[PDB]
Design a protein around this ligand. Structure first.
Ligand SMILES: NCc1cccc(-n2cccn2)c1
Ligand SMILES: [Ca+2]
Ligand SMILES: [Cl-]
Length: 223
């Protein structure tokens, strides 16, 4: 997250870190057994880390649970990033508590102008590289479809939206991938892609979760 703020320990209780020897992507806990992330974050041998603040220090609220299964969306295209969504099942159920909690799925799509919270452990500089240990947060609005399309001609599908600031300065970045965009208490986006971070006229692009709710529910119901 570029241009954000330190969230505070365990104030984003659905935020998880995906770890394969090291943090590599965010995700969002959606029930005691299942995490939402980006398909471009797929790999084997994922450990899900819940209850994290400083991802380099054991601080006492973590739960580390290995993935039993990953499911990439059936229509994911890695070239265009269309349908950039996967589900990860945990080998055992998380203990839910005030610091480790699921985030509700949307019941309708959010509109442009809606305020959202974006979070992660990704890069905090727009030029240069600096990775934070503790979780960073950014309040940002969803942008209109038309300004998203004009920012990225030929690249925005009906399964993507833009959020952030056309002026630049405040955006998600590398390492935030797969993490949440939550608006009015619902998971409306997943950190997906952008051309650099925090550049003018290049806002972040997010997977449009409300398009996927019936696939998420029926996948969970049979797996
Ligand atoms: N600024 C949005 C964004 C989201 C996710 C990843 C990136 N990124 C990948 C390489 C560099 N930045 C950017
Ligand atoms: Ca920790
Ligand atoms: Cl792309």
């Amino acid at each position: 997250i570029v241009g954000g703020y330190t969230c505070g320990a365990n104030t984003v209780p659905y935020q998880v870190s995906l770890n394969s020897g090291y943090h590599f992507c965010g995700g969002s806990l959606i029930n005691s057994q299942w995490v939402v992330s980006a398909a471009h974050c797929y790999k084997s041998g994922i450990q899900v880390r819940l209850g994290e603040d400083n991802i380099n220090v054991v601080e006492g609220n973590e739960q580390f649970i290995s993935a039993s299964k990953s499911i990439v969306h059936p229509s994911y295209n890695s070239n265009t990033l269309n349908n950039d969504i996967m589900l990860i099942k945990l080998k055992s159920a998380a203990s839910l508590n005030s610091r480790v909690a699921s985030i509700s799925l949307p019941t309708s799509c959010a509109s442009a102008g809606t305020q959202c919270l974006i979070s992660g452990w990704g890069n905090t500089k727009s030029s240069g590289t600096s990775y934070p240990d503790v979780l960073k947060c950014l309040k940002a609005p969803i942008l209109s479809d038309s300004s998203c399309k004009s920012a990225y001609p030929g690249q925005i599908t009906s399964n993507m939206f833009c959020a952030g600031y056309l002026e630049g300065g405040k955006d998600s970045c590398q390492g935030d991938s797969g993490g949440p965009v939550v608006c009015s208490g619902k998971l409306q986006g997943i950190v997906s892609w952008g051309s650099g971070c925090a550049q003018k006229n290049k806002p972040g692009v997010y997977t449009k979760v409300c398009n996927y709710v019936s696939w998420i529910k029926q996948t969970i119901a049979s797996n």
